Amino acid sequence: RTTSFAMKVSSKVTTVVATPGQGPDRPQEVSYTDTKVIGNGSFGVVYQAKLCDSGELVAIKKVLQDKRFKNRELQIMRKLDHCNIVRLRYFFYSSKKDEVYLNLVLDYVPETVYRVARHYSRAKQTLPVIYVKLYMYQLFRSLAYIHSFGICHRDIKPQNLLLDPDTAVLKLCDFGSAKQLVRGEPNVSYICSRYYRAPELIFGATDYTSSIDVWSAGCVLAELLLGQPIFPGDSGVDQLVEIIKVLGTPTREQIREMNPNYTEFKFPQIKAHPWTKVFRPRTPPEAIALCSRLLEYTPTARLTPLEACAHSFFDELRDPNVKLPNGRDTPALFNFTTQELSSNPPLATILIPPHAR
Amino acid sequence: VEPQKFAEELIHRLEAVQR
Ligand SMILES: Nc1ncnc2c1ncn2[C@@H]1O[C@H](COP(=O)(O)OP(=O)(O)O)[C@@H](O)[C@H]1O
Ligand SMILES: [Mg+2]
Ligand SMILES: [Mg+2]
């Protein structure tokens, strides 16, 4: 849910003095028009607009700046520059009364993983594995990038995964819950959206790590393969029941890794449900394999985002002769920087095929 | 929530889906 505790009208042309996202504070006049509401979450209202100069479509996220909570959203986005993270072009502030709104001017991205998946669920079809591979691979790259800074998104879900269906590019967004997790400082338990919360979070752990994002991504992967969320339920208990009904009852050791405060409860022993019986019979084995290595009870047992990219499920993307169903060519997949590969540099042998040099 | 109350609810639920 929530986080931790503590314009000139000149078409109808709006002109503001907004500060750019990258570099030092050097604000400039920005004019835009054709403003209309396009999306909303639980916190921010998102507008679309056209920049008067370039004519480029943008998205303007307008969030109320409450001083009762910790708003790292602007602070975090400004330090991020990755091809699988939505770019922050400019930001500015605007004003019932005595209220300050933060405005984030972002690149406009037309679709989300959620909306696309909803299409296939309505049509009683499954998203082609190529797109599953593509979307998930770009997601893990974004996670690898922000984790290298120690930043944890803490709200990985399909509604937060913007898509450009033409170019098949995924961009992570919504850093309203993100935080740089410091080993030693506690965090808020009730974080992340339902269906995608890590088991340790559900148990109320306050000493979790960035591996919660990996769990969420496993939930997304599973959802893409299934056509529905794998761990639904309104309450934490409901969701945990669903998890156990698939992964089997967590061992005392696994419980200790999540939250030591539950090690002495006698939980009924439920036999785990085989992953191959979970998904459709046409489901690729490596997808199933990847899921099981993401959806682990023990946080440290889960793959790292970089390791996940190196998984053999994404081997098709490393093929030099792979293309998009619409005919276009694959997006940027192998332009890894030293920062992205910081957690495990030798993975570059796998991540970067010889035909990408 | 309290670990005691949470565990009770989960145990009650796990007993129903098992038997
Ligand atoms: N840059 C964008 N371009 C197009 N749509 C966006 C963009 N950013 C967000 N949206 C849409 O608006 C919704 C809410 O944005 P989000 O940042 O997630 O707000 P919140 O933090 O309140 O959930 C998103 O689910 C998404 O569908
Ligand atoms: Mg969102
Ligand atoms: Mg949010």
PDB file of C-alpha atoms and ligand atoms in Angstrom, chain A residues 38-46 58-59 61 63 73 86 106-112 115 155 157 159-160 162 173-176, ligand 1:
ATOM      1  CA  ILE A  38      -4.718   8.595 -19.534  1.00  0.00           C
ATOM      2  CA  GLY A  39      -4.053   6.539 -16.413  1.00  0.00           C
ATOM      3  CA  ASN A  40      -4.150   6.466 -12.629  1.00  0.00           C
ATOM      4  CA  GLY A  41      -2.784   4.392  -9.762  1.00  0.00           C
ATOM      5  CA  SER A  42      -3.413   4.638  -6.033  1.00  0.00           C
ATOM      6  CA  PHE A  43      -1.365   7.816  -5.653  1.00  0.00           C
ATOM      7  CA  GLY A  44      -0.717   9.668  -8.894  1.00  0.00           C
ATOM      8  CA  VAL A  45      -2.823  10.995 -11.748  1.00  0.00           C
ATOM      9  CA  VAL A  46      -1.178  10.614 -15.161  1.00  0.00           C
ATOM     10  CA  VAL A  58       4.729  12.815 -23.027  1.00  0.00           C
ATOM     11  CA  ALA A  59       3.133  11.554 -19.835  1.00  0.00           C
ATOM     12  CA  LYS A  61       2.500  12.135 -13.496  1.00  0.00           C
ATOM     13  CA  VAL A  63       1.499  13.311  -7.357  1.00  0.00           C
ATOM     14  CA  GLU A  73      10.171   8.923  -6.138  1.00  0.00           C
ATOM     15  CA  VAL A  86      10.886   5.088 -18.396  1.00  0.00           C
ATOM     16  CA  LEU A 106       7.919  11.199 -18.629  1.00  0.00           C
ATOM     17  CA  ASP A 107       8.219   9.581 -22.029  1.00  0.00           C
ATOM     18  CA  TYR A 108       4.798   8.432 -23.163  1.00  0.00           C
ATOM     19  CA  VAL A 109       4.551   4.672 -23.510  1.00  0.00           C
ATOM     20  CA  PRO A 110       1.258   3.452 -25.020  1.00  0.00           C
ATOM     21  CA  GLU A 111       0.628   0.044 -23.356  1.00  0.00           C
ATOM     22  CA  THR A 112       1.328  -1.961 -20.180  1.00  0.00           C
ATOM     23  CA  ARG A 115      -3.381  -4.378 -20.552  1.00  0.00           C
ATOM     24  CA  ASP A 155       5.979  -2.692  -6.405  1.00  0.00           C
ATOM     25  CA  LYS A 157       3.455  -5.695 -11.087  1.00  0.00           C
ATOM     26  CA  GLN A 159       0.454  -2.338 -14.296  1.00  0.00           C
ATOM     27  CA  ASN A 160       3.924  -0.918 -13.682  1.00  0.00           C
ATOM     28  CA  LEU A 162       4.993  -0.125 -19.709  1.00  0.00           C
ATOM     29  CA  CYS A 173       7.850   2.730 -14.121  1.00  0.00           C
ATOM     30  CA  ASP A 174       6.250   3.850 -10.841  1.00  0.00           C
ATOM     31  CA  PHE A 175       8.985   4.442  -8.266  1.00  0.00           C
ATOM     32  CA  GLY A 176       6.534   5.795  -5.713  1.00  0.00           C
TER      33      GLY A 176
HETATM   34  N1  LIG C   1       5.029   7.172 -18.934  1.00  0.00           N
HETATM   35  C1  LIG C   1       3.733   6.641 -19.073  1.00  0.00           C
HETATM   36  N2  LIG C   1       3.174   6.579 -20.281  1.00  0.00           N
HETATM   37  C2  LIG C   1       1.941   6.083 -20.445  1.00  0.00           C
HETATM   38  N3  LIG C   1       1.235   5.622 -19.398  1.00  0.00           N
HETATM   39  C3  LIG C   1       1.755   5.664 -18.164  1.00  0.00           C
HETATM   40  C4  LIG C   1       3.042   6.187 -17.975  1.00  0.00           C
HETATM   41  N4  LIG C   1       3.309   6.110 -16.681  1.00  0.00           N
HETATM   42  C5  LIG C   1       2.280   5.581 -16.058  1.00  0.00           C
HETATM   43  N5  LIG C   1       1.311   5.299 -16.933  1.00  0.00           N
HETATM   44  C6  LIG C   1       0.076   4.721 -16.685  1.00  0.00           C
HETATM   45  O1  LIG C   1      -0.629   5.403 -15.541  1.00  0.00           O
HETATM   46  C7  LIG C   1      -0.748   4.324 -14.495  1.00  0.00           C
HETATM   47  C8  LIG C   1      -0.349   4.868 -13.188  1.00  0.00           C
HETATM   48  O2  LIG C   1       1.012   5.221 -13.217  1.00  0.00           O
HETATM   49  P1  LIG C   1       1.822   4.939 -11.904  1.00  0.00           P
HETATM   50  O3  LIG C   1       3.211   5.524 -11.993  1.00  0.00           O
HETATM   51  O4  LIG C   1       1.913   3.446 -11.732  1.00  0.00           O
HETATM   52  O5  LIG C   1       1.002   5.596 -10.731  1.00  0.00           O
HETATM   53  P2  LIG C   1       0.824   4.996  -9.289  1.00  0.00           P
HETATM   54  O6  LIG C   1       2.105   5.125  -8.505  1.00  0.00           O
HETATM   55  O7  LIG C   1      -0.242   5.770  -8.562  1.00  0.00           O
HETATM   56  O8  LIG C   1       0.420   3.547  -9.395  1.00  0.00           O
HETATM   57  C9  LIG C   1       0.146   3.217 -14.877  1.00  0.00           C
HETATM   58  O9  LIG C   1      -0.413   1.923 -14.501  1.00  0.00           O
HETATM   59  C10 LIG C   1       0.278   3.307 -16.319  1.00  0.00           C
HETATM   60  O10 LIG C   1      -0.736   2.478 -16.968  1.00  0.00           O
END
